[PDB]
């Protein structure tokens, strides 16, 4: 059975392949090579997991095909879902409902987690009878025991306007927010022909009628948008409200989160913001990142770029990696070297393992020699293409003559550009 | 006032293009957005998994009936052989569908759930000079907000009141021509189509027309 997530480009990278001493292995859990780069990535991963210091920023630089994105996925799989890992491309901040700066702020805050723990007294049971005269009584049941409660006017008004009825499995808290839980299985056969879309029939509780709810849940600090409007959780399902006021973001939510942390009702777990293709940012966004990194509770930035000395967007100026010098001063730069005849063959072997393709050692030799001439990223695509061309030939293993069947159908950037002698 | 307010005219089937009763799929198995104000973290994560009502227990409560309570005291031809078979058949169908629907109507959990949003949602005037509602001086935010700061936000009520003197004198502009709503829309319409719009306008004009009463002096 095929599921939502299937074999993508970085699917084989199940982690960052490092020893307990952070020493990288020759070939380990998905990743191959890049010893220097993977050791550096492991170190910044460790400072992510410690969490003590704020606004650290790392730039993964190097040529196309070294493993910058691969290393980022290694870091992201090595890190558990507990710590928020936010991945965007630099192109995603170029919004219409927001400015560059506000979108970048929202990403920063999406990279900070807050583990709520909430602890509430609850009354739960099947309603046996309701009476109303205004005042009345309510008979609640759990499979263990039954009780009466006397109702005041607010409780009565939230029985009637809720249209609670005999048989409803009801649930009530201190400072009541009464929610209907289920429908009794005795007042049944209602679906002899129909049920309401919200109605359920699962059975009444057991044990004591009064219990305690523990609820634990990681929101991101971007839960600021949960208080930017009248009804506001909606905007977490449609991106909605755009520039929510800084006067509520930076003091009210941070202050109340600190109060929760001190009482013990919450804890910030700072995570990662990975901006891929970061060269796409404008000097406005870069100069914003300048101050954003200095802030008290920024995540760690990871950036990836493949640019040389190039023009900074929004300027006529040229700089390393296409990002300003005043921001490179704020980064630690991890360089990535290309692969040789030894590591190209091995990552092709890994990709065959992931895509479940079997190749002749001749075919591996040919595919490596082809990848070392045109592009690494192309030899990975020929794997699947040859698997398919060999599947129709009534074969079971990709063969040297099949790599050539693919090699002439799907032509590289090199040969593709070389055949533009026609100039239509 | 122009009675020449236009009314658009269309075909029946045009107004019925996007309806189908028994060829459309049930989207109620996918709508996360509809849970958030109404379903609980505890309900989906803790209650339903324990108290899941198996096909078995509902077929059981379809056995002989339960006896009545006693709360008063205080001390502190023939039958067709095929007819009964068919009745049994469709009773079984009925119960299996109670199972199907009671499972399908509790199959997915909230993205957040009501108590998460309650925990996160701060008292409503989040960052204002004016405080939220306070139960009394027993609790902290009664002693943090001055009344003199409250006197300066001048809610829209006093805006209308203090402008009233110049509302009475300087508001005189009218559009030179006026027409009923943008158009009427005549056809051989779906029967339910008209009741629903009338009910919606009842539901609106019943709630916030009293709220438009303050604007009546300007209007």
């Amino acid at each position: 059975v095929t599921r939502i997530e299937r074999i993508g480009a970085h699917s084989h990278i199940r982690g960052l392949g490092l020893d307990d001493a952070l020493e990288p292995r020759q070939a380990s859990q998905g990743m191959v090579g890049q010893l220097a780069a993977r050791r550096a990535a492991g170190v910044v991963l460790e400072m992510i997991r410690e969490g003590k210091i704020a606004g650290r920023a790392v730039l993964i630089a190097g040529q196309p095909g070294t493993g910058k994105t691969a290393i980022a996925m290694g870091m992201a799989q090595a890190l558990g879902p507990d710590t928020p890992f936010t991945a965007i491309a630099g192109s995603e901040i170029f919004s219409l409902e927001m400015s560059k700066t506000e979108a970048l702020t929202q990403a920063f805050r999406r990279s900070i987690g807050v583990r709520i723990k909430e602890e509430t007294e609850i009354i739960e049971g099947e309603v046996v009878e309701i009476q109303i005269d205004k005042v009345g009584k309510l008979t609640l049941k759990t499979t263990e025991m039954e009780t009466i409660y006397d109702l005041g006017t607010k409780m009565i008004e939230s029985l009637t306007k809720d249209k609670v009825q005999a048989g409803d499995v009801i649930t009530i808290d201190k400072a009541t927010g009464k929610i209907s839980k289920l429908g009794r299985s005795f007042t049944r056969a209602r679906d002899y022909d129909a049920m309401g879309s919200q109605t359920k029939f699962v059975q009444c509780p057991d044990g004591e009628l009064q219990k305690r709810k523990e609820v634990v849940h990681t929101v991101s600090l971007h839960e600021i948008d949960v208080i930017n409007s009248r009804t506001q959780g909606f905007l977490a399902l449609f991106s909605g409200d755009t520039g929510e006021i800084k006067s509520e973001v930076r003091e009210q939510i941070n202050a109340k989160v600190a109060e929760w942390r001190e009482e013990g009702k919450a804890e910030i777990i700072p995570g990662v913001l990975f901006i891929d293709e970061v060269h796409m940012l404008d000097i406005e966004s870069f100069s914003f990142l300048n101050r954003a990194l200095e802030s008290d509770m920024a995540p760690v930035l990871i950036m990836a770029t493949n640019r040389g000395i190039t023009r900074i967007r929004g300027t006529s100026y040229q700089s390393p990696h296409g990002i300003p010098i005043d921001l490179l001063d704020r980064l630690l730069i991890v360089s990535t070297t290309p692969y040789s005849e030894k590591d190209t063959k091995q990552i092709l072997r890994i990709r065959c393992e992931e895509e479940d393709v079997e190749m002749s050692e001749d075919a591996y030799t040919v595919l490596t020699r082809i990848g070392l001439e045109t592009s690494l990223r192309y030899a990975i695509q020929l794997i699947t293409a040859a698997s398919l061309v060999c599947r129709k030939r009534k074969g079971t293993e990709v063969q040297v003559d099949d790599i050539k069947r693919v090699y002439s159908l799907f032509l590289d950037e090199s040969r593709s550009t070389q055949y533009m002698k026609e100039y239509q | 006032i122009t009675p020449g307010i236009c009314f658009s005219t269309a075909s029946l089937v045009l107004r019925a293009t996007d309806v189908h009763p028994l060829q459309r799929i049930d989207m109620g198995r996918f709508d996360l957005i509809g849970l958030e104000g109404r379903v609980s973290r505890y309900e989906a994560d803790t209650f339903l998994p324990r108290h899941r009502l198996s096909r078995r227990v509902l077929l059981e409560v379809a056995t002989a009936p339960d006896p009545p309570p006693r709360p008063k005291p205080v001390k502190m031809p023939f039958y067709l052989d095929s007819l009964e078979e068919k009745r049994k058949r469709q009773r079984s169908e009925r119960l299996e569908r109670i199972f199907q629907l009671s499972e399908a109507h509790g199959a997915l959990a909230p993205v957040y759930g009501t108590e998460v949003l309650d925990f996160c949602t701060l008292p409503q005037p989040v960052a204002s000079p004016i405080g939220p509602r306070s139960p009394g001086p027993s609790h902290p935010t009664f002693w943090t907000y001055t009344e003199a700061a409250h006197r300066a936000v001048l809610f829209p009520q006093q805006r209308l009141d203090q402008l009233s003197e110049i509302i009475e004198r300087f508001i005189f502009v009218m559009p030179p021509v006026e027409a009923p709503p943008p158009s009427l829309h005549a056809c051989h319409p779906p029967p339910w189509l008209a009741p629903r719009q009338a009910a919606f306008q009842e539901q609106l004009a019943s709630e916030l027309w009293p709220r438009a009463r303050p604007l009546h002096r300007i209007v």
Partner: peptide, 18 residues
């Protein structure tokens, strides 16, 4: 809860006796 069970037992005995 077990107190409720005990109490109900006593009540049922009384009802049966009368």
């Amino acid at each position: 809860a077990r107190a409720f069970k005990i109490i109900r037992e006593a009540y049922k005995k009384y009802i049966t006796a009368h």
